[PDB]
Design a protein around this ligand. Structure first.
Ligand SMILES: CCC(CC)CN(C[C@@H](O)[C@H](Cc1ccccc1)NC(=O)O[C@H]1CO[C@H]2OCC[C@H]21)S(=O)(=O)c1ccc(N)cc1
Lengths: 99, 99
């Protein structure tokens, strides 16, 4: 589809058998999702933006479905104010910027 | 143009007669640029990111050309990790997300 940017580009995603809302975020290198009790191992990481850094848990090879488009890659989990789909997964669903 | 997301969507902008590089950031409501001198009245404001809130100077009705497309809108100046073009200007240049 085509998403205009009058409002935040929020979409429904499916991850670990859960449905959530997340932003399609071209400014996010990597996907970051709200605290959720995901199974399996992980590696600590710190990610920075406006305001500074937050600590997150990096899970690898996680399966995510974004508007029926399946993807698999890195998902960071932590106390983020918002769920964002980053470029690591946006590339996998064919998402482009167009003007 | 159509921009893929395998790398950061960085483009050249012109503001206040100066060229700069900025990130097209669909997860930013607002446009925030690193510290710089801008002619025009400004008002102090607070804006919040993933790591908290920073102090910015709000300039209104600023002319800014993004990748050859002109926009006139609000520009926040302050300690952002990188120059970001947010939705307030992305809408003006006709930018949509497509997949
Ligand atoms: C380094 C480039 C940007 C910050 C400049 C990176 N951010 C994504 C960005 O889209 C962020 C995503 C974001 C959205 C909402 C709340 C926190 C973060 N938006 C943001 O900070 O926008 C601010 C400016 O406009 C306002 O509207 C949103 C907040 C304000 S981020 O959230 O900090 C981020 C950093 C690393 C990863 N892997 C994933 C996300």
């Amino acid at each position: 589809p085509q998403i205009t940017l009058w409002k935040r580009p929020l979409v429904t995603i499916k991850i670990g058998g859960q449905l959530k809302e997340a932003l399609l975020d071209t400014g996010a290198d990597d996907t970051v999702l709200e605290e959720m009790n995901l199974p399996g191992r992980w590696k600590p990481k710190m990610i920075g933006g406006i305001g500074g850094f937050i600590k997150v848990r990096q899970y690898d090879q996680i399966l995510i479905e974004i508007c029926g488009h399946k993807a698999i890659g890195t998902v960071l989990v932590g106390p983020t104010p918002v769920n964002v789909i980053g470029r690591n997964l946006l590339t996998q669903i064919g998402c482009t910027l167009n003007f």
